Design a protein around this ligand. Structure first.
Ligand SMILES: O=C(O)[C@@](O)(COP(=O)(O)O)[C@H](O)[C@H](O)COP(=O)(O)O
Ligand SMILES: [Mg+2]
Lengths: 118, 452, 455, 118
């Protein structure tokens, strides 16, 4: 038997256990998102710590990030999204970057994953 | 001729029901339909007792159909006025509709199938405490189904040992953990120590990975005072979720708890125990979809819906219909899935379904297809029966789900190409390889007794 | 020590040679398995998925010591006549249950075993409760002797009536009828299970009018009278409020529904009634959905034993005169299970285990449903003078009104009791004694005409 | 569109969004203060952190500073105030410095701004 390493092994939610993602994989989900008519958006932040409170159920700190510009309403091609990512990477090179999606009929997000690490 | 009005124009504030009946030999059908309506309301077809307005307080039959394929089987429709029910009480409704019609001798069997609740009666209930969207926003988890596990053996383990297993299981990659339904307070382990050890394990596990974790704490008790005492402690410690059994406990107690949970911001998980005593035979009892509707009205966040490939009975089409009834907002009539009436929920939140009962890795592609990414999957023996341990077992379960989700997104099939997906993934995961070799030929196939 | 994989159940849960202890709980189901599985595996599977067992071997069991927390099948008997039916017997250690909780006991025995894909039907028949698990319960609030002392009525069965098809009535009209019936000569008066609080009648004013009628009816006759008030509700705060108001008005009895309301609320109400000095009447609704069919469900004699431990004073039991020989033996047996203190084993009456109750009070049975004057000697001779007889349309159907209707029943009951206390046989004479009493009572006449003789 | 930098961008209340202030601007408000018959005063402190309490509304930490000497009562020229600032700057070169004003009729301050940073 082998032992799972407990020291310095952070995880970042969805698609963090599968092998690293490539640019082809990246520009494959953006298309799946577009085929179902959803609005993309980008977010950035320099830390990922989680904080709690003494006696308040359902309260956690560190859930909100910072929005890049504005949701890309009326976007029908993927290329544009990839260019905007390179702009964000050039702007702040010491932060995490995330990609989101939005459904206005049930008012809820649909996916999220990380594309850059410090 | 009286309790059978074959033209009545059903109003929009009435409650409708549909029974299937098995009359004795000789009894004419349009005669038994009129007896069910009266025996469920006043109990007469004459006016010897009225002259005291009646009529405005009686149910009436308005349609009859024959069941195709069986020579002795019929469907009866009955309408009930609105002023017969008390607002905000499921106990009353159940007592008024079903409480005497199942002992009628002139019949041999009876089964209730469906009910239509008008919006003028649904608005007097509170409903689920939070719903679906609010819970996902609170937990900060999007894009994939959630995972969980139950602890075993049931009965026998101490509190320190119980907590040592939760940590190793939780540190491996799962999201939730649960107590067996028959664990309340026993001589070998009392509740107030189990709560503390579980809380410590949860904090230690959360500090490590960097994601939000939780565990369902059982709150069933023998008296209302004890049940309410066991929830204030959970509120004090800051735990996010609790659990309750609603069929052996009661509807009165479930409603009191739902109110408390809405008031103090907790999440409620429901377990369906003893339900198989009522809905397994196909000619006597009450179908499960009625109980699901009743629970959605009473209040809850999760509910067990059953699998279709496990150790317990369950059919596909029937399940696909009631799951839609549980989650959606507007449902159309469809007799090919067991839906008899059109239902409107006038903006009431939904309920997450849960699947559990003898399942392993070679069952992921199917589950992921029957249910979307709006469910919870549980695995008890599939994690604690891994040749290595609990952490290695949890990692194998998460990798399979991630691979299936990626394959679905890339635009590949799942019913035709499923075994391949699992194999290509074991080529780079030393934990998934071990599990696949242990459970290769373990399936469950028997004849269904509740076909349709 | 750990070997990952799947095995059979008959390898650890079938003990053909086990000697049961005196602190164990025993059960008895009748089963009918699917084609393919031998009977032994089936029995073993039930015991496993009801005590401590899964389907694929876990490692956390080598640190708890089983053979001390496991259930065991120790006998299987075939059923004559049927081709695929057998009776099984399982034993349960005492340390598996929580003290004073009926909910826990049920969640374990009947919980997730009636829905396995390897069976076709199941039915629970009997249970044996050790005298060390019963001493942790409270039982009925008062019992039989204490209630009779409180009411000051000896020697004869009690009488009652129910407000039949008369809904949509205002509160004042309800109180008028209640007063008339009580002044007639009866003892108790019921309500209607389907009446809690509706737009045509709320509960507070109905309580007020009934309380006003009871005193004024009581003053003229000098006897203690009562009326059952329904307390079933949607939450636990409403039920407690109604019970508290009923106590404040000084009423002697309340009523609850325990199958559609739940066990937890019933236990809470029983505790309150014991604390504050009230009587509890129990009505059984929806029971026919469980205990009717012969090859699936739960028999009523188990629910009776559960109701006795949770707590209650009256319970419905049905009539036993339209049946026939062979039958009614089960009813006579499970009445004895409700009233007596020590019951021996008898298979002909449907008793599977010997039951001891170590000084617990009894429960009064209630009979009802379509009965008139001509049935009085039979009911007197079957049950004895330890029951309650409820009349429906046999009281409100009199051609002269409500008040004269009760006089006929009272006269007939007194005549039957007097005839029994003289040596005359109440089974053969029967129709003859009623006629003689009808000679000097004009109300018993004109009632012995609407309702004909037996045969 | 452009994005407002969220990283290391502190602000110091009034007149912190306008371009940096010059000595002419400085000796222009001191005069406006004097024309309305108000009393000047100086304050210094080495930090600007704000701290809260669990459940006490309206309580914050870090609002009081240290007073230089005493309020300049009976002052009719600006020059004097500017000299006192240079003395304070020479004394403690690693602290912030603020300028205040006071109204004795309504009992309240009237202005405040920063003039030196570490
Ligand atoms: O107690 C059990 O058996 C389970 O924990 C499954 O355990 P394993 O997965 O370890 O067998 C679930 O409660 C059952 O599936 C309940 O059935 P349902 O969903 O029909 O209520
Ligand atoms: Mg379980």
């Amino acid at each position: 038997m082998q032992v799972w390493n407990p020291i310095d092994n952070p995880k970042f939610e969805t698609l963090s256990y599968l092998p690293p993602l490539t640019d082809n994989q990246i520009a494959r989900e953006i298309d799946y998102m577009l085929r179902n008519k959803w609005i993309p958006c980008l977010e950035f932040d320099p830390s990922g710590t989680i904080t709690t409170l003494p006696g308040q159920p359902g309260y956690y700190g560190g859930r909100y990030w910072t929005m890049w510009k504005l949701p890309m309403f009326g976007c029908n091609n993927a290329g544009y999204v990839l260019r905007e990512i390179e702009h964000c990477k050039n702007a702040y090179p010491g932060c995490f970057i995330r990609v989101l999606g939005f459904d206005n009929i049930r008012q809820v997000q649909c996916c999220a994953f990380i594309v850059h690490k410090p | 001729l009286t309790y059978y009005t074959p033209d009545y124009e059903t109003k929009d504030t009435d409650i409708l029901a549909a029974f299937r009946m098995t009359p004795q030999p000789g009894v004419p059908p349009e005669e038994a339909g009129a007896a069910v309506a009266a025996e469920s309301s006043t109990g007469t077809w004459t006016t010897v007792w009225t002259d005291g307005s009646l009529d405005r307080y009686k149910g009436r039959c308005y349609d009859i159909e024959p069941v195709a394929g069986e020579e002795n089987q019929y469907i009866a429709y009955v309408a009930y006025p609105l002023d017969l029910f008390e607002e905000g009480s499921v106990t009353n409704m159940f007592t008024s509709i079903v409480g005497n019609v199942f002992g009628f001798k002139a019949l041999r069997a009876l089964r209730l199938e469906d009910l239509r609740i008008p919006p003028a009666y649904s608005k007097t209930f509170q409903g689920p405490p939070h719903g679906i969207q609010v819970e996902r926003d609170k937990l900060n988890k999007y894009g994939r189904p959630l995972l969980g596990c139950t602890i075993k053996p049931k009965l026998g383990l101490s509190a320190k040992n119980y907590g040592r297993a939760v940590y190793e299981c939780l540190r491996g990659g799962l999201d939730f953990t649960k107590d067996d339904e028959n664990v309340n307070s026993q001589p070998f382990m009392r509740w107030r120590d189990r709560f503390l050890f579980v809380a410590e394990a949860i904090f230690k596990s959360q500090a490590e990975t960097g994601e939000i974790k939780g565990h369902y704490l059982n709150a069933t008790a023998g008296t209302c005072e004890e049940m309410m005492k066991r929830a204030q402690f959970a509120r004090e410690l800051g735990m996010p979720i609790v659990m309750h059994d609603y069929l052996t406990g009661g509807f009165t107690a479930n409603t009191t708890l739902a109110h408390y949970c809405r008031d103090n911001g907790l999440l409620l998980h429901i377990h369906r125990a003893m339900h198989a005593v009522i809905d397994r035979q196909r000619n006597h009892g009450i179908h499960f979809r009625v109980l699901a509707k009743a629970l959605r009205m009473s209040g809850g966040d999760h509910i067990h819906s059953g699998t279709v490939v496990g150790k317990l009975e369950g059919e596909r089409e029937v399940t696909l219909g009631f799951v839609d009834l549980l989650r959606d907002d507007y449902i159309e009539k469809d007799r090919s899935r067991g839906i008899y009436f059109t239902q409107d929920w006038v903006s009431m939140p939904g309920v997450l379904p849960v699947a559990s009962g003898g399942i392993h890795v070679w069952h992921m592609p199917a589950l992921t297809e029957i249910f979307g990414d709006d469910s919870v999957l549980q695995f008890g023996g599939g994690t604690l029966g891994h040749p290595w341990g609990n952490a290695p077992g949890a990692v194998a379960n998460r990798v399979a789900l991630e691979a299936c989700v990626q394959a679905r997104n890339e635009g590949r099939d799942l019913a035709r190409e499923g075994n391949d997906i699992i194999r290509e993934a074991s080529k780079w995961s030393p934990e998934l390889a071990a599990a696949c070799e242990v459970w290769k030929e373990i399936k469950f196939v028997f004849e269904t007794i509740d076909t349709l």
